Amino acid sequence: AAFTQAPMLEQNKQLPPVDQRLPEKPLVIKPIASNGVYGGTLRTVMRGNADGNGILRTIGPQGLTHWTQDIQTVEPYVAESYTVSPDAMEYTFKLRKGMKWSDGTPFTADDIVFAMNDVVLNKEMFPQTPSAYLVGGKAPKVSKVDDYTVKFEFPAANLSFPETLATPLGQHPTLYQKKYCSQFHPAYNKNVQAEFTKANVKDWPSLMRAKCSDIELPSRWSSTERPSIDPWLIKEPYGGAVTRVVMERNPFYWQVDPTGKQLPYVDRIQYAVVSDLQAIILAATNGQYDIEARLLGSDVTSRPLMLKNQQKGGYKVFGQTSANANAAGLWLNQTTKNEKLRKYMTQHDFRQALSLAMDRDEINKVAWLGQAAPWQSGPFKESKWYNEKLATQYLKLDLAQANQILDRLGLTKRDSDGYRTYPDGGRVSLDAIVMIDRQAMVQTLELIRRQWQKAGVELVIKGSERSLFYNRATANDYDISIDVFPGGLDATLNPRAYVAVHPLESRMSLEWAKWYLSGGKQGIEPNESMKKRMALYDQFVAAKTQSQALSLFKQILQISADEFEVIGTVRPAVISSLHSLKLQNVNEKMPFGWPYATPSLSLPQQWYFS
């Protein structure tokens, strides 16, 4: 009885009063910076007519949980609260009594149970269940406990599930209104076949996708009648050839600010549909967008143009933090077929010397324009996974120490070109594979080649397109592979740099990874420290409590630090973004990435115009 609404809703005479449209207890959103005011149209942009995730990452997945701003944990979001059983298998969600869909009808456990059992877990709909809802490849039992309580029962520990529910790919539970969607489902509509010709499809899964959609389908944004719990609703749909998309506030949105205003603050979102980046950067520098945090930061050429024109365009450039720990890390192949090299590749002090012979300040200045600070492979300080050794050991150039180590390891005989040689002959030479489309990585290797020559080590660059790059890796035909190190902020989601579990990307040895993934039937058996990390990883995946998962995974990171298997160059540059100076409550320190649906991580329903 203390809630208010956007003035524009006063004119809609088929709406109940705002306190009746809200849940009994709406979710209260604390603003990023200040309490807001109603009004305005958020101007943003999509590139082409297959950029529908741009809508999703603008308005935000409305999942059962939501990431915190530092993406260190999640909180109840659509769910009022939830419990986790001691064995980490059972997840029980309480829902917000009185919450309604965009069409004013009830949002209840019926919708979640329909979404899971009749859509997600239906083998005609999804012959392969989306991995978001699996553990060890197995699905949960999903049950209605009462109108506002739903239970997920997995057959194995699954502590990641609340985090999964905060990602775009884990939002199916709240995406399907049973009332609307059941019309297109044969378990509920005996005459669903009559719907096929209407929708212009030939089977009921295609019909469901057409009318009710999926996370990333164009049909999610192509109709006005598909109910949702989104902060804004499609009004001018994202059509195959439309030039703009318009969305308008959901009168039944289920959140208020601390003063009782039903969110969102902003009345409408208008998406310009634009043909290419050249046109998008121009409009952005002209100040035609109130927010752009998806497309411009992918193109390293955009930042100078954006900064130059801030005052002209009335906008502020800000920098988001990529999840990757390293922009261009050296993956050293412990199972290189070069037998003479392998006897050195497997020695910690050899890898240490190579890191000490690198000048990361030069790499940063020359190949990354000074925007990418030296770093190894470890999580960042703002991550709960931070390990100082894993992040910072062996970062500083010490050519004398590198040469002293290499002398000590017996690589003292120089050939006629000045390079070190193995004790029984042969130049100390490492083949590094690189994708030429990663131009900054190629230049980084060129700088490393010049630096390592000062330590008597030859780096031979082998640039190719993607397919040959991956062919060589999977064939175990490389000494070094250069590519990102994940783990700056997403170490458990993407642990490939710390334990050899990714079949294509854990390039300290994909033969080790093949062994792990095949249960020892294929590949090459890893060394003891890696087998131990693999055992710790399996235990971490099966952990029953947060504190147990934390201690197990920290052990993996410590062993990875002690081994020093992969050599980082520089952490990624910030991702350049902009918001108009009038747009308030944008979290300018938020990370970047698809699992967090950025920029919607920042809660666009509490952005507002001053």
Residue numbers in the entry: 1 to 610
What is written in the article reporting this PDB entry?
SPH1118 has been identified as a pectin-binding protein involved in both pectin chemotaxis and assimilation. SPH1118 shows high homology with the solute-binding protein (SBP) associated with the bacterial ABC transporter. SPH1118 consisted of two domains with a large cleft between the domains and substrates bound to positively charged and aromatic residues in the cleft through hydrogen bond and stacking interactions. Here we show tertiary structures of SPH1118 with six different conformations as determined by X-ray crystallography.
Interestingly, SPH1118 showed three conformations [SPH1118 (open form), SPH1118 (full open form), and SPH1118 (closed form)] even in the substrate-free state. These conformations were probably present in equilibrium in solution. The crystallization conditions of SPH1118 (open form), SPH1118 (full open form), and SPH1118 (closed form) contained the substrates (ΔtriGalUA or sodium PG). However, no substrates were bound to SPH1118 in these structures. The crystal structures of SPH1118 (full open form) and SPH1118 (closed form) were obtained only under crystallization conditions in the presence of sodium PG. Compared to the C terminal domain of SPH1118 (full open form), those of SPH1118 (open form) and SPH1118 (closed form) were closed by 18.9° and 34.2°, respectively, suggesting that the domain of SPH1118 was flexibly opened and closed even in the substrate-free state. SPH1118 (full open form) opened the domains more than SPH1118 (open form), thereby increasing the surface area exposed to the solvent and possibly accommodating the polysaccharide more efficiently.
